[PDB]
Design a binder for this molecule. Structure first.
Ligand code: BCL
Ligand code: BCL
Ligand code: BCL
Ligand SMILES: CC[C@H]1c2cc3[nH]c4c(c3C)C(=O)[C@H](C(=O)OC)c4c3nc(cc4[nH]c(cc(n2)[C@@H]1C)c(C(C)=O)c4C)[C@@H](C)[C@@H]3CCC(=O)OC/C=C(\C)CCC[C@H](C)CCC[C@H](C)CCCC(C)C
Ligand SMILES: COC(C)(C)C(=O)/C=C/C(C)=C/C=C/C(C)=C/C=C/C(C)=C/C=C/C=C(C)/C=C/C=C(/C)CC/C=C(/C)CCC=C(C)C
Ligand SMILES: COC(C)(C)C(=O)/C=C/C(C)=C/C=C/C(C)=C/C=C/C(C)=C/C=C/C=C(C)/C=C/C=C(\C)CC/C=C(/C)CCC=C(C)C
Ligand SMILES: COC(C)(C)C(=O)/C=C/C(C)=C/C=C/C(C)=C/C=C/C(C)=C/C=C/C=C(C)/C=C/C=C(\C)CC/C=C(/C)CCC=C(C)C
Ligand SMILES: COC(C)(C)C(=O)/C=C/C(C)=C/C=C/C(C)=C/C=C/C(C)=C/C=C/C=C(C)/C=C/C=C(\C)CC/C=C(\C)CCC=C(C)C
Ligand SMILES: COC(C)(C)C(=O)/C=C/C(C)=C/C=C/C(C)=C/C=C/C(C)=C/C=C/C=C(C)/C=C/C=C(\C)CC/C=C(\C)CCC=C(C)C
Ligand SMILES: COC(C)(C)C(=O)/C=C/C(C)=C/C=C/C(C)=C/C=C/C(C)=C/C=C\C=C(C)\C=C\C=C(\C)CC/C=C(/C)CCC=C(C)C
Ligand SMILES: COC(C)(C)C(=O)/C=C/C(C)=C/C=C/C(C)=C/C=C/C(C)=C\C=C/C=C(C)/C=C/C=C(\C)CC/C=C(\C)CCC=C(C)C
Ligand SMILES: COC(C)(C)C(=O)/C=C/C(C)=C/C=C\C(C)=C/C=C\C(C)=C\C=C\C=C(C)/C=C/C=C(\C)CC/C=C(/C)CCC=C(C)C
Ligand SMILES: [Fe+3]
Lengths: 40, 51, 44, 256, 325, 274, 52, 102, 51, 51, 51, 51, 44
């Protein structure tokens, strides 16, 4: 039933940390895919 | 100009959520329309370019 | 600062998506168009 | 037979016209059977109207009510008519809506209007009251779904008005009829009844959307905590359904 | 959204209800074995209560099983007692009526003789069930509306298989005992006697069949709409009209200009459903005995539409054009 | 005129659009914003039917026939006397049916009751919509809708049914027909209980819900209850309308062969020995 | 509930798997779907009854 | 209809299967086909089958000569080979009184 | 005479609505009947005289 | 004359709605009737005179 | 002349919404009617004029 | 001129929402109508101009 | 002052600047995306 200011500091820190980790693999996967078979 | 007053009548919470659905639906719709075209299908373009 | 009053936040999103889905389906049916055309002849 | 009586009027044609005559009599009978309640027509001012319709009133029929409640002849004066209605005409003629003169939910008009039923509880075959709390009922328990006893009650505007204390059942049909609400001191004083058809039961709360937090203190009460009369049932149910239009001006005014 | 009363949100189960009783001593023929099913209780009553078994119920069940067995065991013998083939062709097999060459006489067993014997047991089973409905209403001191309504259904049941074959003087006019075969009979029956669409009683029976589904959707939704005012307690609303009966009446009065009462709705409901087979029974009876061709009857009586356009596909397109070549 | 109890219910408000501009009663009928549109569309469609009947040459209600355009015209507009009048009436008919359902929403909103009736009518509209616009759109021509004639629209059913060589073998027709014959059975039995309980033999007290509840327990061994019968009765009728929409939308847009040929999947299963 | 519905969800999920699985090894959609529907009712029904 | 690949309304009008005034011109061509099939089966196919066909070419139940019907020539189409002109190149098979190449 | 007493029998409001509906449906019917004939169809006659 | 008394029995805001539907119905119906005729169809006459 | 009294019997906000809907549907209907024809279909005319 | 008084009649948040929805669907519908035709289909023109 | 949401005049202007910053950043990516697409495969 609602969140406080303190909770959002931890919740957003994790979410942004996970977002960069997920995107770190994605950018590597796209980079390797283009070398193997470019689409441009 | 003086458009900051739109938030005096629209709730920023609802507008922010509403546009997210609208923007994604727009982006998905535009991409899939390009696939139907024979000239802007970048998947088929690569096949023609490769050969 | 912040506002702490209740709000039906998800109400406008659902109606936008439903209305957008109609345009989404209409655009696809114009771009690709009629997956099974099933033409028929008139015999009467 | 394949021979026609005259022209092209055979046995099949004759049976068709016989059904036409029978159907016309059937429609006349069926419509007059629906006029046992609500007639004569009357007008907006309360006087009997000059027009009464093509169908005359039916002959009187008698119902032998059980449990020593006497007889009942439907075509006649209606004992369910209400008096001193808190309404005023919005036009000098006919065919225009009435405007409440006070609080529509309290005065019981429009969607919140009740009917003057008998002031006695409905009885089962044995003769005992039909609807009783599960505390009095023996051997009854919740067998499926979510048990609402103990869950907080959330009003139409999100306010929490109390927690469900008991729940009234129809032991004759083993069906839940009402939920007792233990009103908080900040919202009410005692217990109130809400019918099962205006409450949505969730995992952690029960939600009633037709009534705001401030309207709960004025819900009609029962004379006794062990049974509810037909009149009290009709007053309680009408109050909640009347809140679907009178809770706030946004509901009454057009949505577009 | 608001709670639509389509599924009960909580179920309460207590001691089983054994039913009311009077001096007729209904309890001595009752099974007194009850079971509760929660799955069906989400939409209706959750108790599978005891069933009253008398003599009309027992006779109908035993004779009905004999008809079921004779038809079923003949079908098994037809495929040479091959169970895998019996299951595969289950919807296609049947017990065909007698051949037309035998008239009303008893045909050989392999050529419709078992059909007559099986039909004899089905006739006994159906009539016995009607007597049970009539007897139960009398013992409960209730009206005989259930028996009268069921008698209307039997009227088409009797006409379709008993009365009409006698009038035509041939047992071959009966309906085969098959899933798909009695659909084949239905289609062939319409084709043989012209076009059954142009039978005035078939048209009239459809009016009451559509009205039956029309009115029960109207009545089912109206009661669910007023169930917040205790509208599902229809019997108490007849004896003491509450706000549920008033709003339900006023909703239809403001919509279509007239309404009914809580009792009068069930007179409309009873009569449309009862008139569905009563009118159809007359239409089937006149078919073959009197008319023999319904479209030509329609042309004679001037209600068959006439068309002025051409008929061949060459008048609207070409073979190459249709094929896109 | 009013009823003996109607006055206390005729209150202002409850409209969806238009407010008190149209919020009044004409006789027993309630006029709303959608009551105005219903009156316009229904009257326009009715007059156009008789205008087409006048040009057809006959005013006989059995013989009046307003037919769709040819299949050659496709999804476009056709000349009014060559099938265009049918298209206009269809627009009017759809506008009158939707307005009628929306008018029912205003009426049931003013009475503080549920919206089950307008929702049930929408299934009937959906069955009409899937016959006149949805199916013709999939099949690519406005000529696939049924004509507006009392007996002409039976000829459309006859030919459409025989366009698949046996229409009884349609699996959705099989399901949909089962729902009519059962809904009428449920309607007959439900209407009999209330009548039998409220009209016992002369000289006997009327019966309560318990007596009718135990009758079917004595009769078929199970009783669905007073609330259950209406609850299941609406579902049987709504399923009947829905499945009837399915049987006709798959005949031609999804299935072009004969309907008996559909069951070839069951006959030729690998499990069955040869 | 929250378990009977979940067990029903596993049944319908299995039926979809059964349909595509039989289509892979031959059969046909309608032939595969019939066994998928049949597997939905049996396995899904048993799961909701065997464990609650 | 299965042999032609068409349906019942290809030749008939469902409301009147008997009426000659409610039949498409394809009905008359199919009427000639019934006479053709009966003529071919009784006079041409069966007499030659019963005199030369080996036992393995006969039926499983009555050991009868195979016969032809609508689907033998049409297979599944409105016209055999969809109206392909298969007789223009073969005047030998177009008549029984000496080919006329012209 | 005393024909004015009909208004003591019939409400003027309901009669006026009744004949207002009846008279228009009368006018519409007769106008449509003429259009159905060939001699009195003024739409076809105008086309005919145009030649 | 004294036709003004019609407003002593008909409410102005229930009759104006009545003729508002009726007048537009006439305007729509008569326009559609002309469009169906082959002579007064001004939409196809422009095509015809365009040769 | 003196038509301002129409607002004495009709709610200004209710009429404006109603006649806003009527004006758009009428405008859309006439545009679609033109599109149905071949002479006044400006979309097909552009293709016809451009070879 | 004096049109600013319309906000004394219409609720600004209600009309703004209706204006937003109406404008988008109107904008979307016109875009498809161009795509429905063949002359005003910018996707196909690029393919045609490529050849 | 006029406010249907409860925010003050100054609060809305402060919130609008955040909204405009996100909109311009989102649009800036879209423009460079559209610019690269046009030179790669023009639609005019
Ligand atoms: C066949 C040759 C001509 C033709 C011949 C005629 C002739 C002849 C006539 C018309 C008439 C009319 N024609 Mg035409 N007409 C043709 C083709 C067209 C076309 C077209 C696109 O082609 C159009 C749009 C029209 C449209 C019209 C209207 C201007 C008018 C009918 C009024 C009516 O029916 O509703 C009116 C009904 C109403 C009640 C609608 C009112 C709705 C509004 C929203 C109400 C708002 C009221 C609100 C409270 C504000 C009140 C303020 C007041 C100041 C108090 N015609 C062809 C080309 N047409 C008839 C006419 O009326 O002329 C005056 C006329 O006499
Ligand atoms: C090609 C097909 C022909 C056709 C041929 C027929 C024929 C033939 C008949 C109908 C008849 C009917 N048709 Mg028709 N009909 C066609 C087109 C239509 C269409 C349509 C949309 O096209 C419709 C809606 C209908 C509708 C109907 C119904 C109005 C009517 C059935 C009455 C009834 O309820 O039966 C319900 C009654 C029964 C099912 C009998 C009940 C039997 C007893 C009471 C029960 C015994 C139970 C048994 C023992 C099993 C019990 C087992 C339990 C498990 C224990 N027809 C076309 C034209 N139609 C009937 C008629 O004419 O009525 C006048 C009929 O005989
Ligand atoms: C065939 C040769 C002529 C022909 C021959 C005739 C003849 C002959 C006659 C007509 C008549 C009429 N014709 Mg013609 N008519 C033809 C073609 C047409 C055409 C056309 C487009 O072609 C039109 C529009 C008409 C129209 C009409 C009407 C003017 C009139 C019928 C009125 C009626 O039926 O309803 C009447 C409608 C009502 C009673 C309801 C009115 C509804 C209003 C809105 C109610 C408002 C009431 C409210 C309280 C305000 C009241 C205020 C009062 C001042 C108190 N004709 C052809 C061209 N026509 C008949 C007529 O009436 O003449 C007077 C007549 O005698
Ligand atoms: C005309 C309007 C509707 C209608 C009305 C109607 N039908 C009715 C009634 C009414 C009013 C009843 O009161 C009556 C009833 O009892 O309803 C519950 C009935 C009834 N109509 C029925 C069905 C029915 N209704 C139909 C249609 C309709 N009738 C319409 C929908 C139809 C159709 C489509 O034709 C049918 C088939 C029955 C359910 C019921 C009464 C039939 C009955 O019970 O007959 C007695 C027969 C038996 C008890 C046995 C029958 C055969 C069994 C299958 C044998 C047992 C097999 C078992 C597996 C044992 C195996 C043993 C071996 C392994 C050894
Ligand atoms: C089928 O057949 C075919 C041949 C095809 C056919 O077509 C048949 C045709 C047929 C049958 C024609 C039938 C038509 C008839 C009979 C014509 C009725 C038409 C009539 C009667 C015209 C009313 C005009 C009223 C107006 C326009 C008032 C304007 C009102 C203004 C706005 C003033 C109000 C303003 C105010 C301010 C009020 C003051 C208020 C206060 C003081 C408070
Ligand atoms: C099928 O067959 C074919 C051959 C085709 C056919 O056509 C058959 C035709 C057949 C059968 C003819 C049927 C027609 C008949 C029978 C004709 C009835 C017609 C009649 C009777 C005419 C009424 C006119 C009344 C008016 C128009 C009054 C005007 C009222 C005014 C406006 C006064 C109101 C004003 C007030 C101020 C209010 C009053 C005062 C106060 C309140 C103070
Ligand atoms: C089917 O047939 C075919 C042939 C195909 C056909 O098409 C036939 C079509 C036919 C017959 C339709 C004929 C149409 C008719 C008759 C409709 C006339 C149309 C009319 C009348 C529309 C006026 C609209 C006026 C506006 C647009 C005002 C705007 C108002 C502005 C916005 C000011 C308000 C602002 C304010 C601030 C208020 C002041 C407030 C305070 C001071 C508080
Ligand atoms: C043919 O059509 C084609 C062309 C294909 C098409 O459609 C083109 C596709 C189009 C247009 C769609 C454009 C895609 C878009 C826009 C998607 C953006 C992608 C995004 C946003 C990625 C989110 C990743 C979220 C994660 C993975 C977070 C990780 C964090 C996780 C969840 C853990 C957080 C939890 C905690 C920290 C614990 C809680 C903490 C406390 C309680 C303290
Ligand atoms: C079918 O037709 C075919 C031909 C296919 C077709 O092409 C149809 C296309 C058609 C019609 C184009 C229609 C497109 C239109 C009109 C474009 C609207 C687009 C707009 C306007 C862009 C907004 C961007 C907003 C953001 C992205 C802000 C970012 C905000 C950031 C995130 C800051 C944080 C948020 C806040 C501070 C807000 C308050 C919230 C809190 C404080 C929580
Ligand atoms: C595993 O178990 C075993 C057991 C092994 C088995 O096989 C299972 C059995 C299996 C699968 C059989 C499945 C049964 C099937 C599919 C039957 C469907 C039945 C159908 C569709 C009924 C059609 C309509 C019938 C009419 C309409 C009759 C009307 C006729 C009536 C009855 C009138 C009386 C007739 C007479 C002639 C009177 C004669 C009297 C004298 C002569 C006195
Ligand atoms: C001789 O020729 C040679 C040289 C051979 C040649 O050709 C060169 C070969 C070449 C170049 C290889 C081409 C490589 C390709 C194509 C690589 C594709 C693969 C790619 C790109 C990525 C894979 C790894 C993806 C994972 C493993 C992600 C992990 C994701 C995990 C599972 C997280 C998901 C879960 C969550 C986020 C939970 C969130 C929870 C909540 C939200 C609650
Ligand atoms: C030799 O050169 C050759 C080969 C010839 C060549 O160049 C070929 C290239 C050719 C033809 C161009 C083809 C297209 C190219 C290359 C790319 C276009 C596409 C692009 C650039 C799109 C990527 C975007 C990536 C993300 C993932 C962005 C994230 C953006 C986020 C999503 C913005 C939102 C941010 C916010 C703050 C708002 C958040 C909102 C809410 C939370 C509601
Ligand atoms: Fe009922």
């Amino acid at each position: 039933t609602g969140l406080t200011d303190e909770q959002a500091q931890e919740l957003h820190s994790v979410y942004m940390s996970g977002l960069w980790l997920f995107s770190a693999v994605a950018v590597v996967a796209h980079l390797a895919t283009f070398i193997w078979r470019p689409w441009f | 100009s003086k458009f900051y007053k739109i938030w005096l009548i629209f709730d920023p919470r609802r507008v922010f959520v509403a546009q997210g659905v609208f923007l994604f639906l727009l982006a998905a719709m535009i991409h899939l329309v390009l696939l139907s075209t024979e000239h802007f299908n970048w998947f088929e373009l690569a096949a023609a370019n490769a050969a | 600062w912040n506002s702490k009053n209740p709000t039906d936040i998800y109400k406008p999103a659902i109606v936008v998506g439903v209305a957008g889905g109609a345009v989404f389906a209409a655009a696809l049916l114009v771009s690709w168009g009629q997956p099974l055309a099933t033409d028929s002849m008139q015999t009467g | 037979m394949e021979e026609t009586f005259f022209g092209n009027f055979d046995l099949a044609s004759l049976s068709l016209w016989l059904f036409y005559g029978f159907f016309a009599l059937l429609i006349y009978y069926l419509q007059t059977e629906n006029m046992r309640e609500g007639y004569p027509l009357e007008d907006d001012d309360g006087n009997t109207a000059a027009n009464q319709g093509p169908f005359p009133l039916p002959k009187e029929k008698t119902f032998k009510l059980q449990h020593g409640r006497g007889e009942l002849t439907l075509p006649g004066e209606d004992v369910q008519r209400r008096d001193n209605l808190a309404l005023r005409k919005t036009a000098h003629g006919n065919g225009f809506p009435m405007e409440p003169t006070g609080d529509p939910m309290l005065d019981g008009v429009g969607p919140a209007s009740w009917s003057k039923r008998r002031d006695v509880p409905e009885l089962d075959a044995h003769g005992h009251p039909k609807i009783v709390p599960m505390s009095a009922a023996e051997g009854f328990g919740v067998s499926a779904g979510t048990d609402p006893r103990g869950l907080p009650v959330m009003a139409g505007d999100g306010e929490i008005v109390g927690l469900v204390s008991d729940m009234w059942i129809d032991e004759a049909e083993q069906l839940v009829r009402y939920l007792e609400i233990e009103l908080d001191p900040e919202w009410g004083d005692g217990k109130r009844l809400v019918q099962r058809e205006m409450v949505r039961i969730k995992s952690d709360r029960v939600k009633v959307r037709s009534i705001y937090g401030k309207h709960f203190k004025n819900v009609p009460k029962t004379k006794s905590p062990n049974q509810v009369t037909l009149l009290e049932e009709d007053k309680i149910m009408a109050y909640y359904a009347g809140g679907t239009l009178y809770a706030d001006e946004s509901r009454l005014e057009p949505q577009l | 959204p608001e709670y639509q009363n389509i599924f009960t949100q909580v179920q309460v189960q207590g001691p089983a209800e054994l039913g009311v009783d009077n001096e007729n001593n209904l309890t001595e023929e009752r099974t007194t074995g009850t079971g509760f099913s929660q799955l069906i209780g989400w939409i209706g009553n959750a108790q599978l209560g005891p069933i009253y078994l008398g003599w009309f119920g027992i006779i109908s069940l035993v004779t009905g099983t004999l008809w079921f067995n004779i038809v079923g065991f003949n079908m098994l013998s037809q495929v040479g007692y091959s169970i895998p083939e019996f299951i595969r062709q289950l919807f296609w097999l049947a017990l065909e009526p007698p051949s037309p060459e035998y008239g009303l006489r008893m045909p050989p067993l392999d050529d419709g003789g078992w059909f007559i014997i099986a039909s004899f047991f089905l006739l006994v089973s159906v009539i016995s069930w009607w007597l049970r409905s009539y007897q139960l209403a009398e013992m409960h001191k209730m009206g005989k509306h259930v028996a009268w309504a069921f008698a209307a259904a039997i009227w088409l049941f009797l006409v379709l298989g008993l009365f009409r074959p006698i009038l035509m003087g041939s047992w071959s006019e009966a309906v085969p005992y098959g899933i798909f075969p009695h659909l084949d009979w239905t289609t062939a029956f319409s084709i043989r006697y012209g076009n059954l669409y142009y039978n005035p009683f078939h048209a009239l029976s459809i009016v009451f069949l559509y009205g039956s589904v029309l009115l029960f959707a109207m009545h089912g939704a109206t009661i669910l709409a007023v169930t917040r005012f205790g509208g599902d307690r229809e019997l108490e609303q007849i004896y003491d009209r509450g706000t549920a009966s008033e709003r339900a009446g006023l909703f239809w009065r403001w919509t279509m200009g007239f309404n009914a009462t809580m009792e009068g709705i069930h007179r409309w409901a009873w009569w449309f459903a009862v008139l569905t087979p009563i009118t159809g029974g007359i239409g089937i009876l006149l078919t073959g005995t009197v008319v023999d061709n319904w479209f030509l009857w329609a042309v004679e009586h001037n209600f068959a539409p006439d068309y002025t356009q051409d008929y061949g596909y060459e008048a609207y397109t070409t073979y190459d054009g249709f094929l896109g070549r | 005129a009013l009823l003996s109890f109607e006055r206390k219910y005729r209150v202002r408000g409850g409209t969806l659009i238009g407010g008190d501009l149209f919020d009044f009663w004409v006789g027993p009928f309630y006029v709303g914003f959608f009551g105005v549109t219903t009156a316009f569309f229904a009257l326009l469609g009715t007059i156009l039917i008789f205008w087409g009947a006048s040009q057809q040459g006959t005013f006989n209600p059995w013989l009046i026939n307003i037919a769709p355009p040819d299949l050659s015209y496709g999804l476009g507009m056709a000349p009014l006397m060559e099938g265009g009048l049918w298209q206009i009436i269809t627009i009017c008919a759809i506008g009158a049916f939707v307005s009628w359902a929306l008018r029912e929403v205003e009426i049931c909103r003013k009475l503080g009751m549920g919206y089950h009736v307008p929702f049930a009518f929408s299934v009937a509209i959906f069955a009409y919509v899937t016959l006149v616009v949805f199916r013709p759109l999939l099949m690519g021509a406005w000529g696939h809708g049924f004509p507006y004639g009392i007996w002409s629209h039976l000829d459309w059913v006859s030919n459409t049914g025989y366009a698949y060589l046996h229409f009884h073998y349609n699996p959705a027709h099989m399901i949909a027909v089962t729902f009519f014959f059962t809904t009428t059975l449920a309607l007959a039995l439900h209407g009999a209980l209330v009548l039998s309980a409220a009209n016992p033999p002369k000289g006997e007290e009327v019966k309560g819900p318990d007596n009718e509840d135990t009758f079917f327990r004595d009769f078929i061994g199970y009783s669905i209850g007073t609330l259950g019968i209406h609850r299941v009765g609406l579902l049987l009728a709504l399923n009947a309308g829905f499945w009837s929409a399915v049987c006709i939308i798959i005949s031609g847009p999804v299935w072009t062969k004969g309907w008996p040929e559909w069951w070839n999947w069951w006959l030729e299963m690998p499990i069955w020995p040869s | 509930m929250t378990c009977t519905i979940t067990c029903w969800g596993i049944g319908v999920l299995l039926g979809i798997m059964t349909t595509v699985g039989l289509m892979v090894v031959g059969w046909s959609f309608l032939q595969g779907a019939f066994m998928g529907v049949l597997a939905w009712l049996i396995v899904g029904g048993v799961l909701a009854v065997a464990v609650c | 209809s299965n042999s032609l690949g068409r349906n019942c309304v290809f030749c008939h009008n469902s409301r009147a299967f008997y009426d000659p005034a409610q039949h498409t011109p394809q009905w008359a061509t199919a009427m000639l086909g019934i006479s053709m099939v009966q003529e071919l089966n009784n006079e041409w196919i069966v007499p030659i089958g019963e005199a030369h066909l080996p036992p393995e070419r006969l039926g499983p139940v009555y050991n009868d000569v195979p016969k032809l019907a609508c689907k033998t020539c049409h297979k599944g189409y409105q016209q055999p080979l969809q109206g392909l002109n298969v007789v223009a190149d073969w005047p030998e098979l177009a008549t029984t009184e000496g080919p006329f190449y012209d």
